[PDB]
């Protein structure tokens, strides 16, 4: 029960230890903090946190039995810096005394946990995510790490699921009471940074079930998230991603007030080692409110986008005949032939960055018109995908477990310094 030994959390533009053991926490000025409990380690020398642990308590006095958890957001490789990204390992958190202890380090797309015992014997376990996926769930997106250690095993879990295990039976005493230094340390680019959140240390080996429960608890928000895992905001420019159509994007049809669906361009240059689909493409959307700028579940919104100079709006025709229809993309108007009001939803009960977009006849009405999605229309005659409304989604979204791959699952992508293309 009482298993938390460091609980680094935000309070009053600072980070403090809430564990009750009174670790001294010194955040130097180069660490950026925000009240969403996110903090940024940069390449600058004063970008560091020094934690001095309670020196009169030993939590693993006889056998190894401890865990570390945190969320992290690691920027995408620079396309012209792939060799350094792949090869240059840098520490981000170090807890050593007399050349024994643990550290967390990163090498490109790999995050690494290392134990070093009093005899200098070394063991590591790591998680490496693909850097050749069209769409990555991990690159520059917030994800949840938990590492556990016992007599036999060092494990890394990602988003609650076991990724890797290393046998550490031949590891002896590891000195655990050293200072904990949060700082980038290695042959790094000047532009390199890491974001982290909710860093915690536990004095037992957490079970997968326990880890999964913390994943859900720490994921939970009344607001919706963007593609990167940050809070979704009003009045902020976004590209749109479709979870059921990963490689597809929305573009205003030439000389027609509808949204056609096109295939994402991909990594253009010629590195054997990387691949991705472009993200900063398609119309630039913006969410308008119908005290903060955060978009919450059940909010009523307008979905707008910029057509060159003008802010246009996404509508559905009130009286479309079939189960699905093309959305109407047009100037802002109070027309009585179109519904303009969208309720933003979260039908998934599990953590996700996807949201769903519901048209209703009226805010005080429980009458549902349909969900925004993508549909293959037939109109020589050919098939062609369009930005659509569909009634079929209405029953689909109530099925358990939730279908992550429904075309009514959207994510919003803002420009982010951690993703360049």
């Amino acid at each position: 029960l009482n298993n938390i030994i460091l609980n680094l959390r935000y309070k009053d533009n600072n980070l403090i230890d809430l564990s009750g053991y009174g670790a001294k926490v010194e955040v130097y000025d180069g660490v950026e903090l925000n009240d969403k409990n996110q903090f940024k380690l940069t390449s600058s020398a004063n970008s560091k946190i020094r934690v001095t642990q309670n020196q009169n308590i030993i939590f693993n006095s006889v056998f190894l039995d401890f865990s570390v958890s945190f969320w992290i957001r690691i920027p995408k490789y620079k396309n012209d810096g792939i060799q350094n990204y792949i090869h240059n390992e840098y520490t981000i958190i170090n807890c050593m005394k007399n050349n024994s202890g643990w550290k967390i380090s990163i090498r490109g797309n790999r995050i690494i946990w290392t134990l070093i015992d009093i005899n200098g014997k070394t063991k590591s376990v790591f998680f490496e995510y693909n850097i050749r996926e069209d769409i990555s769930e991990y690159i520059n997106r917030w994800f949840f790490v938990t590492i556990t250690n016992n007599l036999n095993n060092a494990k890394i879990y990602i988003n609650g699921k076991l990724e890797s295990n290393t046998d550490i039976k031949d590891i002896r005493e590891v000195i655990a009471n050293g200072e904990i230094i949060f700082k980038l340390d290695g042959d790094i680019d000047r532009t390199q940074f890491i974001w982290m959140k909710y860093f915690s240390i536990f004095n037992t080996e957490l079970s997968q079930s326990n880890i999964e429960e913390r994943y859900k608890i720490q994921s939970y928000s009344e607001y919706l998230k963007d593609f990167w895992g940050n809070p979704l905001m009003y009045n902020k420019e976004y590209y749109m991603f479709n979870a059921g159509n990963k490689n597809s994007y929305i573009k205003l049809k030439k000389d027609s007030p509808v949204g056609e669906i096109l295939t994402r361009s991909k990594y253009n240059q010629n590195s054997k080692y990387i691949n991705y689909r472009d993200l900063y493409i398609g119309e630039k959307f913006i969410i308008r409110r119908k005290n903060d700028d955060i978009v919450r579940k059940e909010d009523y919104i307008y979905l707008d986008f910029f057509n060159l100079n003008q802010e246009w709006r996404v509508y559905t025709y009130k009286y479309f005949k079939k189960e699905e229809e093309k959305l109407f993309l047009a100037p802002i108007s109070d027309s009585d032939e179109f519904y303009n009001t969208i309720q933003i939803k979260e039908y998934d009960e599990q953590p996700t960055y996807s949201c769903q977009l519901l048209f209703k006849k009226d805010e005080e009405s429980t009458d549902e018109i349909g969900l925004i999605g993508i549909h293959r229309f037939y109109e020589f005659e050919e098939y062609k995908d369009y930005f659509c409304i569909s009634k079929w989604y209405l029953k689909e979204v109530k099925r358990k477990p939730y279908n992550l791959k429904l075309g009514c699952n959207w994510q919003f992508i803002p420009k982010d310094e951690g993703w360049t293309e």
Partner: protein, 38 residues
């Protein structure tokens, strides 16, 4: 006026030649000149 014009092309875009015609009549267009648009 511009909005109305788009509303017409939307109706053309989804089939329903009828709504297209109706909107054109309301928008201000010519009964005959509406036959050409379609």
């Amino acid at each position: 006026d511009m909005f109305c014009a788009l509303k017409i092309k939307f109706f053309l875009e989804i089939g329903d030649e009828d709504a297209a015609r109706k909107a054109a009549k309301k928008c201000g267009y010519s009964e005959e000149q509406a036959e050409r648009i379609i």
